User: Fold this.
Amino acid sequence: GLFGAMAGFIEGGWTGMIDGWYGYHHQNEQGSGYAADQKSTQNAIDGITNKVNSIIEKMNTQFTAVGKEFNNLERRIENLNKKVDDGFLDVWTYNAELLVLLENERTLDFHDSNVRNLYEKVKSQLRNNAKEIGNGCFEFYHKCDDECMESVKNGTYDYP
Amino acid sequence: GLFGAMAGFIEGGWTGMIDGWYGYHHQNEQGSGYAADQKSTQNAIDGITNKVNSIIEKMNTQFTAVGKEFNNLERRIENLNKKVDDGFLDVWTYNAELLVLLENERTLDFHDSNVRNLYEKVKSQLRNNAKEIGNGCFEFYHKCDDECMESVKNGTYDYP
Amino acid sequence: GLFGAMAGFIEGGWTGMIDGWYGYHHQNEQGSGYAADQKSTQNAIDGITNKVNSIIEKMNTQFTAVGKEFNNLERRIENLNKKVDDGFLDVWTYNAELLVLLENERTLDFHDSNVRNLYEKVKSQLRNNAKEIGNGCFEFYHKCDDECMESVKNGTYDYP
Amino acid sequence: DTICIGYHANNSTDTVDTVLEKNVTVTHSVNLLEDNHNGKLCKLNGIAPLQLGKCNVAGWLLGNPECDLLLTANSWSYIIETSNSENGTCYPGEFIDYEELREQLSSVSSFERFEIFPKASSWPNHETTKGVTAACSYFGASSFYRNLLWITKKGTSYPKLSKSYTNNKGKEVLVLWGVHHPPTTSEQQTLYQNTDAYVSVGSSKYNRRFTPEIAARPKVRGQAGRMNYYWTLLDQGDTITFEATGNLIAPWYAFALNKGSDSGIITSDAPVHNCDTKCQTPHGAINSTLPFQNVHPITIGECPKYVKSTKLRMATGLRNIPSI
Amino acid sequence: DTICIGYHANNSTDTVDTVLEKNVTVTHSVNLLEDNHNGKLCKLNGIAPLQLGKCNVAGWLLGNPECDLLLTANSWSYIIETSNSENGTCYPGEFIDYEELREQLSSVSSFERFEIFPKASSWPNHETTKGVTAACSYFGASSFYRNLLWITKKGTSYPKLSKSYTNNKGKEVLVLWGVHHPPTTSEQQTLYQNTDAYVSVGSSKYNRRFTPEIAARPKVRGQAGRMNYYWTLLDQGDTITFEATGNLIAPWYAFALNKGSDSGIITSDAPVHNCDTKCQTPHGAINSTLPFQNVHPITIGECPKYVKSTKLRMATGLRNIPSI
Amino acid sequence: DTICIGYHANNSTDTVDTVLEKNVTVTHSVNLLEDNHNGKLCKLNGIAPLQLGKCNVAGWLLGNPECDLLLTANSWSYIIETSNSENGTCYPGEFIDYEELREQLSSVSSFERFEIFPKASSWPNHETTKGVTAACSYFGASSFYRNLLWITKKGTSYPKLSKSYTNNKGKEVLVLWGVHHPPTTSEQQTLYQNTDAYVSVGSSKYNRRFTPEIAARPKVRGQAGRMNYYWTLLDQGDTITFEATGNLIAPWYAFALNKGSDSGIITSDAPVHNCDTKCQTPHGAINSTLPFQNVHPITIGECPKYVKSTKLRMATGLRNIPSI
Ligand SMILES: *[C@H]1O[C@H](CO)[C@@H](O[C@H]2O[C@H](CO)[C@@H](O)[C@H](O)[C@H]2NC(C)=O)[C@H](O)[C@H]1NC(C)=O
Ligand SMILES: *[C@H]1O[C@H](CO)[C@@H](O[C@H]2O[C@H](CO)[C@@H](O)[C@H](O)[C@H]2NC(C)=O)[C@H](O)[C@H]1NC(C)=O
Ligand SMILES: *[C@H]1O[C@H](CO)[C@@H](O[C@H]2O[C@H](CO)[C@@H](O)[C@H](O)[C@H]2NC(C)=O)[C@H](O)[C@H]1NC(C)=O
Ligand SMILES: *[C@@H]1O[C@H](CO)[C@@H](O)[C@H](O)[C@H]1NC(C)=O
Ligand SMILES: *[C@@H]1O[C@H](CO)[C@@H](O)[C@H](O)[C@H]1NC(C)=O
Ligand SMILES: *[C@@H]1O[C@H](CO)[C@@H](O)[C@H](O)[C@H]1NC(C)=O
Ligand SMILES: *[C@@H]1O[C@H](CO)[C@@H](O)[C@H](O)[C@H]1NC(C)=O
Ligand SMILES: *[C@@H]1O[C@H](CO)[C@@H](O)[C@H](O)[C@H]1NC(C)=O
Ligand SMILES: *[C@@H]1O[C@H](CO)[C@@H](O)[C@H](O)[C@H]1NC(C)=O
Assistant:
């Protein structure tokens, strides 16, 4: 996306990973599988949750009765009332429409950014001990069992 | 910019590249020149195009007659009409003004991001087979003819 | 943050650095200390300054008298006046509230981006001549005196 | 041995639009547009509305013979008129400041209908039993409004009347009345004799006077005569005096009410049920959770800002790119 | 052998402003502010406007002797008044609910001017040829409005008149009239005799009555007398009855029209041409493509939201940093 | 030898809210919400307001005996009424188009009070010294408005009066007057004899006539009689003529003023000081620097958009994460 990770250098999503938004997939002599990164997923949720709340919570509305009723000799103020109604309903239409469009772009980037920081979080630990295959994958130059796979997930990968 | 590529680690633009927004420039024993990356340029266009459309398309307007006409014994509703006109015209002035300012910042970043992802798209393929000169340039540790120059452009650069 | 630098791979701030927003801290046989990067700090200030100005400068307001006064047989236009007041004051409440929320997210990212570009600005010069310790620190594989420390700060670090 | 870092994907079909690209399939989304309702007229904030059915506000308050079920009206948070609300002023005339009254009576706490000026002895030496027209027919029979009294003439004498009422109801009183306007001067005298009559309503906060405006005009639903309806809100402890030499359609019943705020008049043929709601509209009740709605521009209560949008879907998850 | 990745640059001078920095030169931009017009008054949606020139709405509808070209008026999507629009009520008086009428007649589909009450025999035993004033001079000569008829006195007798008109035009009819208000009672009687006259207009939807309000007042463009102008929209099949003992400036011509919607009155001295437009303003036609405009706060049609901005330029390309 | 790149931190406690996270401690912030004032009523744009104190606009303009300090009123940019502003129409009646007058007199440049119709000889053969009521008591004594003159009867004769005034003040003149409405016809004649009187005010731009509307009504602060107050803005060079056979509370003093614009009426019990301000409110002066304010919905001048927010803090610095 804006951070090249999503539908970018990691062009596909994992139907297999079902416990989180961003995460890992390993493959070693012992077996394979997915494991969502719980921290970045939780934090992402808290943020998206908080974000939706703001967009909803910040919308203040008082008790109002929109309709008016004007007689045939009050066309001018009736049209003024109209101008007000069309006016606000034009402001809220353009605003809501763009607030979503703009915030949607921001949420996808956000996710993309989270993936890129994760992939980068790992590239950091592995350094020399793995080779990068341009697909969001790392191939250890050594053997990495489940404990070792775990270590990198919980950010504690040894001498690199 | 926000992604350090534009007027950043690639401090200048190419007057020479005239077929796209982002792209390459090679130099090998066979000759030199520019070649805009057609994909990222097209995609960028589609996006900026779609973006301008939204800002214009999402603006709904119904048939309205702004003016009103109130007589000397209707100063209060005349001032109310005024309040409405100044009101909306204050909302649309602040909004339009910032919508541009904010979206402009976003479009430049967007471009910057596109350049950084391209430069990164290449750094990936070349790996060990080229040295980075902090200016958005790569110097192959080997000889790279036109086919080879092409290969990296169409993302198919060999054993790195 | 969005660029992983702040409260990210450089999880803490420097109370010690008191002359700028982003900067360095060195440690060599000759002594240690902080030195804010003046350029990126200045530029950041100019930008944040200019940004606050826009949010304030772009707010146009004409001489207005909000209040109205309607008698007991003018409840309808009094409620229309109300609708207008509540209307605008609902638009400005939702807008201001989100303008801040959204721009705050943007300012923090901005800072984060500035730090990441600085850290990256340095990683570039040092290349092979230093090892990255995942904390925003570089350890020269050689001896780097004050002039050498200076050189990297003013972006002129030698053969890497 | 390899480890890959990636992202979630599923069978989601939700699509959102972004600044740069349309219909992007996303794994998780939330809707910010309330566009569904319950095709029912609910109680706005725990207080059912007032249904007028075949009648409209004017018919209800004046006492049109067709609005007898409305004589017990009590509470209500907003008034409901139907596409059948047509029984109003069965006797032709202008209901002065009608819109205004409708607007002010939108929301009412208490509302007791009391006999302010009793027919039975209140108008001595005045005919109080002829004020019955065919325009206001009650079951084939000729009748009249139930809250107003058409004071005619006693034999061949119509003396100057003068009744006052002081509101000791401990709340505002809605007093309604009318001034009759004969077509000529033959009816003007055959009914109120004094061809030069007048009607004057006085209050510490009211004083408009009247005189019949006899003139030739097209008959409406029967009569060529006309009756203007006037109302007024009488403050506590205030006194309203009536006195006339004719053409006075005197108040029979007035209403003692307690206005809290003001809502409006929902006009729809939708069913009324014991449901509740913070926001009500003509098509039905709307939810007050989302920041926007597109069910109807006209709403009553705390409502979601109305918009012309049909889709305001917000992404919460990431782009959906499955395929294994 | 080297390959460099970079970005485009050109001779562009377009500058945009961003949240963080002003006047950033960009390679490509788009304007979102419509700030140019055509200094011409066009046809709003394929229907030319109505030019009143030297006349204003009141003069046009009443029949001021100076607005004879307007007697054929037809169609129009909005009305144009000029800085020369001054021929209105040549005879002093208040045009009742004038603003309101101007507003309602803003947009008209069809509009036929017909002789509702013919001068030639319509007012038997009444002088219909003296109603000519000098205030309303037609070529040095004394004249009067062409759509209203000043009914004076026949010799020394002014009997009670009574003409009705039923709108069978299959559309609304705009009926205009006036009530004369002499300065004293010497003119009041020399013209309508009956020093106690009255005028009454009746409809199934109208009934206001009148009586001359003689009183001393400053002469205006000649007379110390006054004429209030009244109008009314007569529904199809409805009947309007007029009858008076004097002071009635009776309707001669009425208008049968078909209102579709309502626009407004553009008042400008700009030229009118056969161009078209979705949005019209006083200075000229505006484009309806961009989301904002700064040409004029007052506009008619589907227009771009008016703003105080002078520059709303959007970047589409990247920063421009040439130099080879 | 190592070099680290990092960021600033300090003892800041400022917290801002972001789209993704609340109360984020930041090193530097700026406030965009003006929520403090000075509990003082200042001069709006270098022109102090007009304090009415115990009086309200009606009492001030009419000349209520309790508003004598206001007889020198001059300049003012906005009017201040207090929770003590209760001395108005000491004599019961409707102040016609009152709201409208209050609104138009909001802002005034110059304002000279002159004696338009001098009591001392201006009303020949008319009692000009009895027009004193107890409702309008001046120090226990019975008095009356100082700008209006209650013309009664001379012995047992009340002839038709007729005074005109032509505004040669080189600016607009505010003429105020009243029409008395006796409760019956015994007072009607004991004061103005002619039981059929009338009052007519004429101008090149005004002509409404009047007739006492005697009728029974509750006494207010003393009298059962009523006085409607009327005003009018007399253009330069125009003439206003008054003439009546009774019930005319004639103008004694009128005001020659110069209206520049229009503000409003701040009603608060807050102290008035020689401070200045671009934006004024009931609680005090507000700053016009920030784009938003929450001090009061009702404001006068160039003000910050009012919002329901309590906190609109903008981050300028980065997140604060100290700890050494
Ligand atoms: C109240 O409204 C009804 C319904 O409009 C009146 O009846 C009218 O419509 C009937 C057809 O459904 C017909 O009876 C007539 O068209 C018309 N009424 C007449 C003239 O008979 C009804 O009369 C009204 N009742 C009263 C007295 O107010
Ligand atoms: C209609 O308007 C014109 C233009 O205002 C009237 O003429 C006025 O202006 C003329 C100068 O251009 C002068 O003739 C007068 O100032 C004035 N008219 C008079 C009093 O002669 C014109 O009279 C009006 N026509 C009618 C009858 O309505
Ligand atoms: C102007 O206002 C004052 C204050 O309201 C009038 O006095 C009223 O209030 C007084 C108590 O503070 C009492 O005197 C009365 O309640 C009432 N006035 C009466 C009827 O005495 C004062 O009279 C008014 N002055 C005038 C003449 O306008
Ligand atoms: C989609 O997948 C979910 C599992 O999360 C399952 O519950 C649901 O039935 C599936 N529906 C479709 C569209 O196949
Ligand atoms: C997206 O494409 C168009 C808009 O670009 C829209 O009409 C359609 O509903 C969407 N198509 C699908 C099913 O993704
Ligand atoms: C700018 O360059 C374009 C080529 O794209 C050329 O057509 C145009 O004439 C040039 N104008 C200027 C400002 O030199
Ligand atoms: C940009 O600078 C100022 C605003 O900062 C503006 O007035 C001027 O027009 C611009 N200068 C140019 C030509 O770039
Ligand atoms: C915070 O630190 C500043 C130094 O910038 C100092 O001036 C101030 O007194 C300190 N206040 C607190 C909260 O300790
Ligand atoms: C932030 O937490 C809550 C809102 O999340 C707020 O009420 C409180 O004031 C803040 N706490 C502090 C002191 O940081």
